[PDB]
Structure formats: C-alpha cells, structure tokens
Amino acid sequence: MSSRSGNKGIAALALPTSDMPFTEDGLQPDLIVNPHSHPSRMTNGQMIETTVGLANALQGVVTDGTAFLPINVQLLSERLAQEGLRFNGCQKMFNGQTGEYFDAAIFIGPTYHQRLQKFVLDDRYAVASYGPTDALTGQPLDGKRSHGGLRLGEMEHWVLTAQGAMQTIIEKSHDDSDGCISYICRNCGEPAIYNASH
Amino acid sequence: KTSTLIYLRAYELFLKYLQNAPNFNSELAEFKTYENAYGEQKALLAQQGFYNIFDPNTGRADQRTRLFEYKRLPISTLYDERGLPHKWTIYVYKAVDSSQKPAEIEVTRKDVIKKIDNHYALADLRCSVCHVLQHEVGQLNIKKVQTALKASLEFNTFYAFYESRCPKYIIYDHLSQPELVHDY
Amino acid sequence: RKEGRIRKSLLGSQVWSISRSTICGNSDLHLDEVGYPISFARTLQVAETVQHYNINRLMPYFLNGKRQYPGCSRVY
Amino acid sequence: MLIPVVCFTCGFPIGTYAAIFDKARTEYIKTKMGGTLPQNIPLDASLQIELKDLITALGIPMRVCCRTHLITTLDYRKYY
Amino acid sequence: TFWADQQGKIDKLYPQIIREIFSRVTYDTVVKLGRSKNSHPEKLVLKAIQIPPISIRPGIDINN
Amino acid sequence: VGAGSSGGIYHLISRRYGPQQALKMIFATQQLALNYVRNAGFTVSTADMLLTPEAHQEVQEIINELLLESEEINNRLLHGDIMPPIGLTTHDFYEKLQLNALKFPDRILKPIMNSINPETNGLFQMVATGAKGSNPNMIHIMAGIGQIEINTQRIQPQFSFGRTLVYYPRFALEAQAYGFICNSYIAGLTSPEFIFGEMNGRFDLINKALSTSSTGYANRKAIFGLQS
Amino acid sequence: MKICKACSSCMVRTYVDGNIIFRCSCGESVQGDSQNLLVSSKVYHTGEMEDKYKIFIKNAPFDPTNCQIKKDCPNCHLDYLTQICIGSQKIIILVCRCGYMSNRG
Amino acid sequence: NRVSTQSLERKNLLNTISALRTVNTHNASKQTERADMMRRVHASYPGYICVAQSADTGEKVGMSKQLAITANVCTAGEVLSLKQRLLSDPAIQQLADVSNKDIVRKGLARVFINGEWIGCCTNAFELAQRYRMLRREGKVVHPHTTIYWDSMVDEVEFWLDVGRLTRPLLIVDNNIEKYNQACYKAAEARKKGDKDWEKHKIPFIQNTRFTPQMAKDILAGTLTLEDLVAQGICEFITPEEAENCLVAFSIIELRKHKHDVTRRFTHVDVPQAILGLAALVSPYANCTQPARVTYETNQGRQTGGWYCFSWPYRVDMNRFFQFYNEMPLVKTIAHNYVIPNGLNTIVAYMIYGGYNQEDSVIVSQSFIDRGGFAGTFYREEKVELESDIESFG
Amino acid sequence: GEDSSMDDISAYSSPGLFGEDIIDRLDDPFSIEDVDISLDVLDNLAPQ
Amino acid sequence: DFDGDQMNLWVPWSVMSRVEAELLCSVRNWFISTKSSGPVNGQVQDSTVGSFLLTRTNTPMGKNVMNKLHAMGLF
Amino acid sequence: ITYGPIETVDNEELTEADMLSFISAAVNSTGLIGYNIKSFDDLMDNGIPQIVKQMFNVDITYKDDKLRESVQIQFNFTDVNIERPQHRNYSQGNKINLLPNKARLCGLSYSGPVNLAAEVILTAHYSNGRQEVKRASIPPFQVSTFPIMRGSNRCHTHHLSKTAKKEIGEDPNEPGGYFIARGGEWVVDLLENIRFNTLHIHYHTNEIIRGEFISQPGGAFENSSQIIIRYMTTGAITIEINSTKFSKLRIPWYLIFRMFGMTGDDSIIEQVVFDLESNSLVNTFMIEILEKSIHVLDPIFQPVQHELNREKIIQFLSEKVSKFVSNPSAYKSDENAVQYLNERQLTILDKILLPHMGQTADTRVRKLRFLGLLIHKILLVIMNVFPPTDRDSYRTKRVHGSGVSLAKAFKAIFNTSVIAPIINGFKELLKQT
Ligand SMILES: [Mg+2]
Ligand SMILES: [Zn+2]
Ligand SMILES: [Zn+2]
Ligand SMILES: [Zn+2]
Ligand SMILES: [Zn+2]
C-alpha cells in the first residue's frame, strides 16, 4: 500500500478491531504507519493531507489540495482547532490490547491510501525437489511460469564461497540442479563409458 | 422515463447504423446533443461537493501563505562598522527568575552544557568580533559599515594583486599603514 | 554473455527445493529466526533418514502424512 | 462501487443512510451551485458545500471515519 | 578460404593441398618455432569432423 | 544501542560473551523499548514541523541575510570589482562566491529549536537520537531548502543562452534564478523552486541507477581477480 | 584569398623560393608582394564579444527576456536599462533601445 | 522501426491516460555522460513535459516522459497560405531579389518557414512582433504557428509542422509605451527646469486580461480556450517560442511585480501546468520532496482501482478490479479527469509494537474484512488447436 | 528517377538522433549485466 | 527493507548441509561485520527512539518512573 | 484590433483556484488525448491517399519478337480509401461490421480494408528504337487491411452513442486512441524525434564537428533526405547525402556545389561566407578552412576533383551511386546512355538534395545558397562562436505519434508487400507472353 506522497509499505499485521488503538471518542485507524517513515523522505504532503482531512471529515467537505495552490499550515491547524479538535491533529488514544492510554497524544487522521498491484500471492513461489528440467543442461526450468527453478546465481555462489560453505554448495548445485557422475579413464584422460547393471 | 427514452433511442440508432439507414448522420448528431444533455444531468448526480476555505478578511479563496518574501535588509546585519563579517558565536543567557544572581551569562557553544542550566533562557546572540548583540544590529550605522566594507574590499584586491609584485600582508589589522601604501 | 553456457549454467544454477516471497517485519522473532508460512513448510521437505535413534521421533511425521502438520509425503 | 454498508474503519452502518444521503446531497448541491456546469463544480473557487448538518440530521455521529466514507465513496451508477 | 599469388597467378589453397603442405612439415620445425609437439599444423585441417553428441543438440535447432 | 555503532553495548556483549548473546540482548532490549513505547506512545504531527510566527520571521531574516550577501557579491560584479585569483576565471570565481555565500548558518537552528518542544516533538526526537533523519532533513522541512547544487555547482543556464528557466530573465543575477530555494517544504515550494528541486531529485535517481549498474561490473571484475 | 583571374579557382601558395608565387591548376601564376608573405598566425586574446555578440548586443534592448535594471540612460533618460553579462570574464554591458552602449561594444 | 508502441495495460484509468500521453525517446547510448544528461529534467520541459513524472527504478528513469497537463501536440499547419502572405509582405525581400552581399552589407535578417529559407527583412524583431500581433488577431496567421526570433543571429523562424509541443499561456500586457512617453516628458521637464518633474511620470502597470468574470464564464461553459485565444487573452507558446518568452510563474508573482518595470513578463503561467496528470494526483506536491512526487507518479499508475469500466465484457490477464473507490478528502485537479483509485483510510502515525518498522503498515483486520482494498483478480487461459487433429473433450 | 520500387526501404525510417552512424561497442551504463539478479527480484533494487 | 523486497529461502535437507549451516553459516557469525570489523545489528528507528524514551531521566509528566506492574509489563 | 487598456482591467480579486478554471479550459480544448485521434484521422484522410498516389509511382524497365529488348513498366495508383473493419460471418456473407469487443475476444485485428485502383502503362522498347505502349485502367480492388485506432473516424464506435457503447462493451468514458491487434490493445506512443529542416551540430566526441540536416520537402508525410556535413581531421569538408536513392556516399562539398553550376570556387566560398570582399576575422578563418578543404585530396572523387566540367562530374557521380551500372565503359560509347545517366542523376539530385527548398531545376542555385548557409553555421560552431546544438533541448525536438509513425512504417511496408510483388508478377507475365 502507498499514500499519495509516495510512501510504499508492505502490510504486515492483522489486528482485530479490539486490538486496534482507539482515541478517546472511539476513532481507530485502518492503517498504522510508523512515524519514522517521514523525516528521511520529507513527505510532508501526506501529513498536511491528514491534517486537512480531519477538518474536512468533521465539516463534511471535500477540498482541493492541488500542487502550488496557496497553503497555510498554521491556518489549517487553526481550522482544526475551530473544528473542536486540538491545534495539531493529535488526540488521546488508548492502547487496544491493554486499555491503557498512551502518554503522548497521537496524530491520527484520514489519509488517502492506494493499494499497489504487487500482490504477495502472485509473487510467492515454492518448489519441491522435482519438476520440469531443461533438456540441454539438465537444470530446472526458469521461473514460476515454467513451474520450476529459481536461480542461485553467480553472486550467491560467491557469498557461499566467502563463508567457506561448500557442502551446501554441493547440495544446492550438484544434488539439486544437475548432479551427475562423470567417468574418466584415468589412463588417457578422456571421458569413458561405465554401466553397473549392464 | 428520460433514461428509458435515451436507452431505446440509442439502440435504435445502433440498429440504424448497422443497416445503414439513409439519414443516419444528422439523426446521430441530434441524438448526440440529447445524450450530451443527459450526460451532463447524470454528471450532476455524480458531484460529491467541494468546499473552499475562505479568507475571513476577503470572502474568496484563502490566499494567505507563509511563503518567503525577499525584504532587502541593511548591510549592518552582516558586517560590523569595521567591515568584518559578524560571527554569532557567543550566546547570551538571561535568568528567567529575578533572584538567580548571575542573571546574564555569555558563553561559547561548548561551555553551554558546563555552565547553563534549566533556570536560564536564551536571549539574542553576541558577535564575537565587534561585541554587538544580534537584536542590536540596527544600532550600527549603515554608512560606516558600507564605507568600511568598500575600503576593505579595495584593500583586499590590492593586496591580492601585489602579493609579490612591486607598484613600480595577510591580516591587514595594523591600520593606517595600508592607507599610505594604497594611496602611494 | 550473461545468459550463455558459462555464466548461466556453470557459475550459476537453477535449484530445486527453494522458495521466494516478500519479506515483512515481525518484532516477536529473534534476530536468528525467520518466519516461515506453513504452506511453504508443507511444500519444502527435510530429508531425515530413519535409524534406531530417531524412528521414535520420526514416526509422528510419517503418520501425519499429507493430512496434518507436521506431516510428510515421501519415503525412499 | 457503492457507499459501503458499514464504515470500513469502525463498522457503524452508514449504508442505512446512504441511499437517502445521495439524493439529499444532490438536492443540496442543486441549491448551493450557481451558473456552473456539473463537471465544473469541483472547480468553482466561490463554491462551498458543507454536508455536516445534513449528515447530522441523518443521525450519523460526529465520527471522522463514518463521515469520510459517506461523503467520499464513489458510486458506480454515477460514472458508468 | 586461402589464396596464393607468386608474382602472378593466384591459385586457391584448398583444404586438401593445405593438408599436404602441413603434412610436409616435421616435428623439429614445430618445436623450434615454440609450438608444442601436440600443436602440429597437420591437425589444423580435418577430413573426418566430429558430430557433437545429441545431449548438446536435443530436438524431435543446430541439428538443422 | 544503534545498529552499526562501533563500541556500542552489543559490540561489547559480543566481545565478552559471544555474538549469540549479543543477538539475544538485541532482541531483549528491543522488546523493552517497544513495550515502553506501547505504554508511552510516540507520534509525529504536522504541527511538529510547523514554525511559530516569530520563528518564521527569524527564518525569513536569516534567508534575507543570505540573499543580502549574495546581492553584495552581485553588486561587486556589477561594478567590475570581481577579480578572480590566478588559475580561475571570473565566472568560476563568482560562482564560487555565490555557492559559499548561500550556505545556511548554524544559527538557522535557533528558530527551529524555538518552535520545537524537545521533550515532546516526535520529529526532533527521531532526528536527535539517530533513529532516523538528520539536521539537514529538519532544516529542509521547517526552515528552508537552500541552494540546489548539481555536481557541486548551481543550476547551469541550460534553457537558453544565459537562462535557467522561462520563468527567469536572461542574465538574471538574483540567487533564486540559479537554484536557491528559499521556501521550506512545509511552507510549500513555488513553481520554479519545485522545478529546481525536481532537477535535483531526478539527478539523485539517475545517480542511484548508475551506482547499481557500475558496481555490478566493478564487483565482478574484482571478484574474478581475487577469487583464487 | 587568391583566386585565379582566368578560371576563378583556388590557387595554392607554394612557398618557393625567396618569394611567394600563387599557382593555379591551369598554370596561372600571379606572384606576391609584401602582404602575401604571412603564412599563419594565432593571436592569444580570449575575446570575441566584439563580433560574436555584436548582433546579440544590438538586439538586446528589444529582447523581452533580457534582465533590466533601474538606471537612467544618459542619452534618452529612460529610467530602466537592459543589462547584459557576457563571457567568462563576466563583462557587464548596459544597453538601451536608443543606441546607448555604456562604453562597451 | 520508428513506431514507439507499448502494450496497453489497464491497471486503472490514470495508467491508460498516462500511456496515451507518453513521449518516448526510444533510441545506442553507451557508457557516456550522455546517458545521465539525457535523463535529467531539462529546462525546456517546464510546461510541456512533466517535470516530476518518470520511472523511479532501473534504466527507465527519465527515458519515458509525460506531457504536461495543458501541453498539446500540434498538427500540420497551412504552410502555403503563410508562405504566400510572407512573400507578399513588403518587408520580406524574396531570395530572388537579394544577394548574399546585400544580406551581410545591409545587415538583413533571414526569414524561414518550416526551416525553408525564403526572404530577408530589414528588422527581424519588427517582423516577428508584427506577425505575433497578427497571430493574436487570429485571421491571417493561424494561432498555432510558431514565431521564433533568434536574437543571436537575427533569424525569424515560422514553424507550422506537425509534432510541435504547445501549451496555452495567458498574455501579459503593459503600458510601456505610455511609460516611455511619460519618461520623455519628464526628461523635457528636467531640461526646461521644472522643480517637480516627477509629476509628469506615470506608474508602470503590467497585468493579464483574465478577469475573474472570465473564470466564472469558463466554469459556466460560455467561454472556451478558443474564445480566449480569439479575444487575445491568451496564446499558444511552443518551446521554440518559449525561448522568446518571460513567463511569470503565477498570478501572484505578476501581482507582486505589477509595477515592476524591470520584470516585464510576456506571459503569466498557472503553476499547476508544469505537472503531468499523474503527478497532479499527489496532494500538496510542492510540500513533498520532489523525488517522492516521482514515486507517486509511478505508484498512482500502479494503483489498483476500477481498471476498466467495461471489465465484465473483457477477458484480461492479470487485472485487478478494486470494488470500493473514494474521492480523496483532499482532492486535486487530476481527479476531474480520472477516477480516483484508493480509499480514505484512517491512518495513525504512531508506534504500535514495532511491527510497522522499515515502512511496513499495521492494517486493521476489520478494515480488510469489511471490503477495504478488496476486489477481483482475473486471469485467462486460452489454447488453440494446432490443426483439425486436436479436439476439446 | 521517379521510380519508387527499388528505393532503399530503410530510408523511409527518418533518423531520430544524431550519431546513428557513430558506433562504439561499450556496455550500457545502466545495464544490469554483471549483477546476477532475477527478473522478479529486480524490485529489490527499487529505492525508497 | 519492507517496501516490497523479496528474499530467497531454502531449507537444507542433507545432514552435511544442516551441520554446516548451523555450525558455520549461522547468522551469529555475521553479527560482527567482515567488512569493517564492527557490529551490523542493533536497534533501528523504533527501538532506538524507544530506548531513548525508556532511559531518559524526565518525561513531560515529571520523573520517568513506572510502578511494579508496568516494570513487569516491560519484561 | 485594439484591446481595452491594461490600466482598467481588475485583477486583484483573482485567486489561484480561479486559474484552475483556465487549466480546465486548456484541458477541455486539448481533450487530453485529442492529438492521437486527430493525427490518426489526418493520416487516413490526407497521408495515406497522399503517400499512395504521389509518392509510390513505379517506373522500371526489365529485359528478357527477337527485336524486343526491354519492357518499361509504369503504373500509378489514383484511388485509395480505408473503410471500417469488416468481418465475414459465415464465409458466404456480405461481410459485416466488426465491433471492437468482437475483435478483442476473438483475437481478430481491428483493421479496415484498403481499396486500391491504378493506371498501368506497359511500354515495350524494341531494337532500333521501335516502341509500343499497352495501357489498362484497373478497377478498384482490395488486397490490404489497415489497423484502425479505437475512437478514430474509421472506428465503428465513432457513430455510437455512450449508452450504445455501454451495451456493446466499450467504456463509455474512455476516449480511445489505441489499436487492437491479435487479441490485445496497443498504444502507439509519441516518438521523440529531432526537428526536421534544422541543422543539428554536435561534436564528434578522424572526425571533427559534424552537422546533420534532415530535409522534408513538404507536409508531414513526405520522405526526408538527410544530408550530413562533416569537417574531418584531414582538413576536408565532406557531404554525405542519404535518401532512398543515395546511401553511405561521402562527397566533397565543392563538387556538390559545382555539379549544379558555378564551378568557380570563388563563388562557392562566396556562397559559404556570404561576402568574399568583407573584412573581419570570421571571414578570414572561413576562407582559410574552406581553401584547405578544397585543396585536400580525396580517396574516391580524385578523377573529378579538379574537373571544371559539370557534365563529367554528374556522369561520374551517376556511375558511382546508381545501381545497374556494373561496367562503366560499355555505355560510355553510346551518347544516349550517357544522356540517360546524366539526366537521371540530375533528376535524382533535384528530388533528393535539400528538397524542402524545392524539387525542380530552377531551385538549384537557392539550394546551393542554403547549403552554403549550413556550412557557414557549422564552421561558426567550430569557431566556438556558437555552442553545439543542445541534444536534449526541446527547441529542436518533435513528437511524432500514431499518424506520422504509422505513415513512416507504412511507406516501407507498402513498398515491400505491394510494389515488389506487383513488379515481380508483371516481370513474370512478360516472361510468359
Ligand atoms: Mg526495498
Ligand atoms: Zn582410456
Ligand atoms: Zn466509522
Ligand atoms: Zn586558373
Ligand atoms: Zn536610451
């Protein structure tokens, strides 16, 4: 999900409506975004959108927040104050799980949010120890579409070497991609023919 | 009933286009006008409202902004009466209470944590070169600052050219010697 | 080139028994721990040979089979 | 595609008052508009439409979530 | 293809007589020229080429 | 306790008792902090980044002083008083003077700090404790963006011969015409200021793409050189 | 330029021997006297404002995009004046629609 | 191949309309400063190419551009009519009559039309200004023609070809003629010896003719851009001509410089014009860091919503139809033209258990269940028989 | 001279850049060629 | 980060691979950077600001104290 | 025309949200996609008939009753119209309208048939100059289908109302502007292209500064012949002309000047510098470099390097550049063969060199004047009097979408898939009878 200021975020928590923090007057959020996402990215448009959306929701209005329109953060906050809320958008919230109130008044408001179309169910993949194999090199086919594979590339081999791993390298490469036994005459140095059954 | 009329007339015009009825083009034009009117009236049903934050002083869209304004300043806000740039490095502190007898403390940034505590508040800064308060810059005379700055710049250029050369040395604080050298 | 014989077949490889998915935070896991969805754990398998010391422990995995977690579907 | 049956955030059933609210809002916009085409209503610089009293008369409390999702949710019948 | 002009007519150096010429050279010339004994120029030209195994050319495209 | 902090408590825990105990202590201290915030709360608000009117006038005064010394450089240029040192042309010396004269002084933190309650300001606490952000971020958000520099120089006049944008005249000598953004992010950039900021941001994006692409070949060549 | 009188073609210099004779491809030779005896030169003065910007400096007072400053024109006493800054030396030239050129150009 | 084409992925209405408004360089460029330089925001982009919209990832950064909100692409103009008009102009000396010696010695300027050199004028500026006035009148010179006057070499260029980027700019008019006459009268007063010669001067006034009643009419539909061009209130400016303009970036700047005789703007802009359609979606974008605005230009086109109004009739691979969409409580001009995609979720900017660290989001399970960001995701499987040998069954 | 049959069909494609004759075989400075990253995980390279 | 990153995970199945993983490739071995010889892990963002809040002397309410119940809640 | 005085217009009460109304007016006039549909309609209305009729005239001669030596095939199309897409329902149907959703679902291509009619002249030239002409008026036939952009005047939805589109399966609100091809939707983007009839001078960063001038004779659809002027490290200035006729051939500039006349080099230098008698440093450097370039030898054009005969140079170039001349000595004896080659070369150059100035013989001097102006500009840039053209600025860039791109691909595709099979079939038929 992402707000209209360009703050992407992967949804990782499913909190029932009782576990969600709530304000003094019963308002709880749909999304809880970390405050640390702001200062490095300087996405102040999202915060101003929230501080205007609170007053807009209370007044039952819709406002134009087009770029380069005149804006006064002080006047928007005073609009919040005249709407009955605090000068800042901050409110008294209670922890949903334990019922205790937070010491710090929490900034909560309606921020427009977009669900970007990169779904987990499309992108997740897990393949067992067998499937379609490439005819030429005897290796698994490429990608989820071909129904097998996923690549342990050059840099993964470099990293496993840097750890002195091997064994795991033997497993993943040989025993899991195209492991085979190669017979060599040892008297002439050329590949030979061996068959235990026949 | 109007939507019923529009729907059935649109289907009839679709059939007429498919069978190539003779006067299809002008009928399509007038039905396009009617559909335009009906689409406008359906667009009215789609409006959710729109509110403009009005300026109380001027009953129009709020044009008050906190944007930067240029506001040219006097030159004494950058230099002293001797033409040297201000170095706002000495911080002046005042005691909020009337009984804390030290009252005024002037400190350097490093010594602040050693010397100043919560019983104090910060006033305007102090220049460490000309000993003028930050909020007392306006006390300086503009003419003297300007003439000192121009004279110092002329001296700077003259010294820069003649670092080794002869008409026919890094600080310039000696004074009244540079005048007789420059006029020479 | 990258997709040639050497750099795509020898230096790299396509491997079986591997999974990929989006990562997300979890403050309840130790740093040395990773959260693994149960569906993946049912897809991926761990080879445990049956010996005298582990047959007791490995029996529940066998009898759970395809139906319950932790189960198993392969025997050599 | 329609105003939700309940407010997404909290679950208060704004869907009861939805169908009444669409028509009431249309009627109120009719009076508050002027010499302005419908497609230019979200462009008027001298136009202010507050639905606070209307929603309050609908019985919906002073909740940010419910009023937001009531006044903002798009209707598919209006665009298609 | 190789040619040869001897202040005159340019005869074509076909692989056959090229094999003949390379077969004329002896091991001492190759060794004294720094090439390995296994680097004799007679090996450069082939009459019986090697067809690669089907493992490297599957199909039911280079097989064409 | 911060990550990548040399000599921090987890480094000493690893040195004395082992990296596994360091990871265990990292998790334990993280849970302590997270629960204390669960009961203490923490947030950032739009009013955390909003200056008081007196502080806004002070920010305006500081930026006016910057522009005043820039205009003094321009006035020296007008009368032909810009005499570059040897090995430098008048254009380069003048650009150097403007670049070194349009720098935010340390004093710019006085109005920012006067608007900010450190005990409660979420943005200031996040910046100060090293959790996220830096003083430049706070200054950009609250006071002003300042000079926009690409390759350690102002916006070169690419629009035409002697023009940076259609919004500024040819041979414009004021500082804003060459990339100096006076407005802060919270105050809202004007159109040319946003154009210059977008130039800088696009340059950053291009630089990051180049970083990835070039470190590719560099790393591969180094690895193959050293791998044996 | 030396052109052949008969056929109007370019005539090479042919610096031989004590004098210079310009020889065409049709054989015509026209000799050389004093002013023909320069071969090549490259003067060192990083200045083209006199000819590179002559058209631009003339047109500048009519250019609406040029910067103006609040100064009086000595010739016509308009209170505004267009300001040009030229070259690496950042030469400032003040011009006006009346032809005033401020001692430069 | 000179056919810049891309598949039409209907991620939403905004993505489709931005696909139809995309300008592709479609070059090659090896390791050079060229690759960096051609991806930067050039100073000629403002108003014609979106200064914000671009790809934020990979090699596509700055490669794919977007037209600004008001920018348009011209069609081929009537070159023959303008050529005949110019040739009959007494101030254009046709090539048949002027030799190159007369070109240089008389200081004659060179006149072009669509790059074809025909004619020479005594004064390039006068000819360019007069034909700009005629274009403003709108009859003899089409309003979509470019009249560029290269002051560096005194060459007037008329361009009527296809593909010129154009955008309408409101025209700024001033009293510079009366100001000059008042200055001359004051000068004569000084010469005569008047003590209060300041009395004869007049204040400089520059303004635009766009009155608020014009805005009310445009809202009412009784006034169009065709009428504004016809009345001379605005005009179309091309980058070639844009290099001959001095544009006040907003009516606020023009009002501030209303009496400034040192900044005589040729035109006045609307600052929202410099941004594309997708970059206008971001609210208070001038308050956000511009790089984040570019990220928004990408994400708003990736955003799930009503991807196609006729979705049931279609069979599209990997398309997501988000059931509920909301007009933002803080909307922008972009939402007049495209359907918003998303919801006005209540967002609490707070720390809750640390599960939202490193830009993760804690989502209410009830908001998920009630329908928030839900929808239908579609896939298609199509298979054709190789020949009559095959059969379904 | 009026024949259009034997025209160079590649001439109809009007050149769109300057140095379409300028040829140097060098790595594209944006090409992810020596970094071995799969197509779907190229989203890891996305900044934020 | 969690802005959409995708990461690979394979579970070793051979006995040698498991031994090697848990004895040599365990992440405890990478706590101290091989690059700069310092630690790589620690408290980031949330936990850093949380430790600052927890360890400071005074809150806006006065002394930064908690009763026994909330001290137990921390652990 | 005089407007109201600017001292009276009341602008104080005008807000930014009012200026948003002007933004809306601009968008409404534009249509926000309008250029796509307008350009495609312009294509089908002007360009396709224009290209087919004007540009694709065929005049070739082939050699295979023993007195007959060659057959001259000449034909030209004067009829071309693109009607809306059709589908044949049950094979034996009358063909019926193909609505876009039907194409999308069945994988059909939203292509409307192209109907063509031509006039053909088959003229056979015998030995000793006997000539016979066979002529036929060929009725309007149709073997072609041109993809139709959705929403264009040849799209079926153009005469359907919004509700009619709703029930058909189109988005009533979507404008169109894309192509349906093999079950997909494709958008022909606006190609970013350098400006035609504009000299682009960027440094060769054995070459030095290079200028490229792409000349388009007429409207949007005329084929453009690019001329590349190079200043080389050898001191020479060479001109390479690329077109349908020429390719990769590098020619000294003075040769190009003198095969149109004025073989005198003083007039050539005058055409470049615009005044030989003029003083000043620019003329002096110009003269120096031009003289050096004139006197420098050339690997290829040495035989005509010092030739003052225009005809000999024209014949030399016609030998070098024209195909079908494999032994340039047999035709030399026949004066009529030389006349044919010279006249063909002069017509080719009149059509190819700087066509935007003209395409006739009377414009050759003015073409040379413009070429001299181009060389003057290039050598001005080499002075550092001018900077190189900004390769990324939009002062010299164009966006060509749908109509222009489709026409530029269509001329090549139409040639290859229509003119070549037709010529081959006529040659085979003349073989058979
Ligand atoms: Mg990431
Ligand atoms: Zn053997
Ligand atoms: Zn609610
Ligand atoms: Zn001669
Ligand atoms: Zn004057």
TrEMBL record, chain B:
Source superkingdom: Viruses
Protein name per its UniProtKB record: M1249L
Organism for this UniProt entry: African swine fever virus (ASFV)
UniProtKB/TrEMBL annotation, chain G:
The protein, known as: C122R
Automatic annotation (TrEMBL), chain J:
Coiled coil stretches, renumbered: none
Homology family: Belongs to the RNA polymerase beta' chain family.
Function noted in UniProt: Catalytic component of the DNA-directed RNA polymerase (RNAP) that catalyzes the transcription in the cytoplasm of viral DNA into RNA using the four ribonucleoside triphosphates as substrates. Forms the polymerase active center together with RPB2. Part of the core element with the central large cleft, the clamp element that moves to open and close the cleft and the jaws that are thought to grab the incoming DNA template.
Subunit structure, interactors included: Part of the viral DNA-directed RNA polymerase that consists of 8 polII-like subunits (RPB1, RPB2, RPB3, RPB5, RPB6, RPB7, RPB9, RPB10), a capping enzyme and a termination factor.
Annotated protein name in UniProt: DNA-directed RNA polymerase subunit
Organism: African swine fever virus
Complete-protein stretch covered: 457 to 531 of 1450
UniProtKB/TrEMBL annotation, chain K:
Domain RNA polymerase Rpb2, chain residue ranges per copy: 249-399
Bilayer-crossing regions: none
Ranges of residues in domain RNA polymerase beta subunit protrusion: 32-423
Family to which this protein belongs: Belongs to the RNA polymerase beta chain family.
Annotated function: Catalytic component of the DNA-directed RNA polymerase (RNAP) that catalyzes the transcription in the cytoplasm of viral DNA into RNA using the four ribonucleoside triphosphates as substrates. Forms the polymerase active center together with RPB1. Part of the core element with the central large cleft, the clamp element that moves to open and close the cleft and the jaws that are thought to grab the incoming DNA template.
Name the record gives this protein: DNA-directed RNA polymerase subunit beta
Biological source species: African swine fever virus
Portion held of the full protein: 8 to 452 of 1242
